[PDB]
Amino acid sequence: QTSVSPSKVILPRGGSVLVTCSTSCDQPKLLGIETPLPKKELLLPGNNRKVYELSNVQEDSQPMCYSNCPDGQSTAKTFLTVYWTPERVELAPLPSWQPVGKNLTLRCQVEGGAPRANLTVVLLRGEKELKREPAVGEPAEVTTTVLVRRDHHGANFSCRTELDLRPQGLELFENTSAPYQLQTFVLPAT
Amino acid sequence: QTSVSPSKVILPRGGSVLVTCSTSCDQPKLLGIETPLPKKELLLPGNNRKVYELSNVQEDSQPMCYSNCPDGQSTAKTFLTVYWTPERVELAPLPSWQPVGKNLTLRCQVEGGAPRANLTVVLLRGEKELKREPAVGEPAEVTTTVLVRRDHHGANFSCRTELDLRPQGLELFENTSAPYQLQTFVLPAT
Numbered sequence A, B: 001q002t003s004v005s006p007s008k009v010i011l012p013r014g015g016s017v018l019v020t021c022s023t024s025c026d027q028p029k030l031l032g033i034e035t036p037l038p039k040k041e042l043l044l045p046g047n048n049r050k051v052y053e054l055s056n057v058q059e060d061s062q063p064m065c066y067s068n069c070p071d072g073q074s075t076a077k078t079f080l081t082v083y084w085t086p087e088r089v090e091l092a093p094l095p096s097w098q099p100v101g102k103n104l105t106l107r108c109q110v111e112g113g114a115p116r117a118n119l120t121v122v123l124l125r126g127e128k129e130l131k132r133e134p135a136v137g138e139p140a141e142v143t144t145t146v147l148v149r150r151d152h153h154g155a156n157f158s159c160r161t162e163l164d165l166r167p168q169g170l171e172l173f174e175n176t177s178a179p180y181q182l183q184t185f186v187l188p189a190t
């Protein structure tokens, strides 16, 4: 039967990879790989083995080797996970000056991060975390409400994203938005 | 200049891999890879690129692509880390029966684990850890002394090894020795 190596792959957008599709019939009728990716085949001996160079990996895809040993068949997919740190991570624009007392509502907007399963979005207050949830949707958002206090003057919040590719062998990639600086005031005023 | 992909590889003993050695001179004089590993070369187009299949990876090795662009040159090594869970993990044999009072000394002997940098050896008492150090030497050992107590009767210790390949994308591989069961006695006796 058909087999492929590797079976799981973590790679950058655009990145390419080598995939080997091997079988166990000594003289199989057909052997190839089923994918839309720009592929390329190489001079590998003992043709019970074929090596393809997949190319413009822009998306999580699952290439599939297929070896046709008569009626029926058998296959084997490989999991290509494409990774990339969000194109933009910022809080919706807001006026720094805010009235003491309102249940102000912060909203972080994230655009295009992948794999979204390892992407966490986190609203903070300085380096103190407020809300912390996974990135979902596009642009993915996250909200929290701050009851503005006199104490908050000078306080400044930010939104940060965490792309944890550590368990996949890579790193934890983070991105921080520009800081929202809160200026408060009590009334009698302005 | 010369470049290689991947640059770091974690693989099983025996395991093989595909390495690509690419250069940037459009018409370079020489391009190949410097290694003792059984290698094999494939039909890859645009020969500014060569793909080798390294084979009997029994050891941490660092294969090196070299592209000769006139006098001088340039190269690029790839890091092959070969992994394998210890062949044997056991405590030196000891008589279960021990006198209340002695500073009994336990000794766990580990043979052949790799990469030793991620291999931790840990002496335990039931599932309660006693000593916990990295595996060094061959057979690598680890010792601790238990002052035998009347309370210890029925207590049983073991030695366990932890091969943490999680940060490298793999898993944490563990191995537990057979359990040393302590039987104590106070004297007047036997």
Ligand SMILES: *[C@@H]1O[C@H](CO)[C@@H](O[C@@H]2O[C@H](CO)[C@@H](O)[C@H](O)[C@H]2NC(C)=O)[C@H](O)[C@H]1NC(C)=O
Pocket: A084, A085, A086, A087, A088, A089, A173, A174, A175
């Ligand atoms: C989010 O953070 C990532 C990682 O810290 C940034 O991406 C890196 O940017 C540097 C400088 O351009 C490059 O040398 C790296 O190759 C990039 N790595 C990746 C995975 O992209 C990224 O620029 C940040 N996002 C934004 C919008 O600035």
Ligand SMILES: *[C@@H]1O[C@H](CO)[C@@H](O[C@@H]2O[C@H](CO)[C@@H](O)[C@H](O)[C@H]2NC(C)=O)[C@H](O)[C@H]1NC(C)=O
Pocket: B084, B085, B086, B087, B088, B089, B173, B174, B175
């Ligand atoms: C130490 O633990 C490892 C992992 O739990 C054992 O190795 C696995 O053994 C099973 C059964 O033979 C195989 O299916 C796996 O392919 C093995 N994995 C690896 C990485 O070897 C190993 O047997 C244990 N060591 C000893 C001496 O028993």
Ligand SMILES: *[C@@H]1O[C@H](CO)[C@@H](O)[C@H](O)[C@H]1NC(C)=O
Pocket: A115, A116, A117, A118, A119, A164, A167
């Ligand atoms: C990382 O991403 C994978 C694949 O998207 C997901 O299943 C896994 O749970 C995530 N792990 C962490 C630690 O984020």
Ligand SMILES: *[C@@H]1O[C@H](CO)[C@@H](O)[C@H](O)[C@H]1NC(C)=O
Pocket: A103, A104, A145, A146, A147, A148
């Ligand atoms: C804003 O409102 C929520 C809901 O009442 C509350 O839990 C939160 O504490 C308020 N924020 C602050 C900073 O007081």
Ligand SMILES: *[C@@H]1O[C@H](CO)[C@@H](O)[C@H](O)[C@H]1NC(C)=O
Pocket: A125, A126, A127, A154, A155, A156, A157, A179, A181
């Ligand atoms: C952001 O807000 C925190 C918390 O008030 C503050 O300590 C930090 O210095 C602020 N950052 C900037 C750039 O003002």
Ligand SMILES: *[C@@H]1O[C@H](CO)[C@@H](O)[C@H](O)[C@H]1NC(C)=O
Pocket: B115, B116, B117, B118, B119, B164, B167
């Ligand atoms: C894993 O092994 C590497 C390479 O041997 C070592 O440098 C690294 O510190 C180890 N990490 C852990 C978490 O054991």
Ligand SMILES: *[C@@H]1O[C@H](CO)[C@@H](O)[C@H](O)[C@H]1NC(C)=O
Pocket: B103, B104, B145, B146, B147, B148
């Ligand atoms: C055996 O000796 C060491 C050194 O005195 C001591 O620290 C240890 O507590 C003793 N073991 C036990 C179980 O009492």
Ligand SMILES: *[C@@H]1O[C@H](CO)[C@@H](O)[C@H](O)[C@H]1NC(C)=O
Pocket: B125, B126, B127, B154, B155, B156, B157, B179, B181
């Ligand atoms: C090993 O010793 C522990 C601690 O005394 C005990 O709880 C455990 O059951 C023992 N294991 C066996 C197999 O006897």
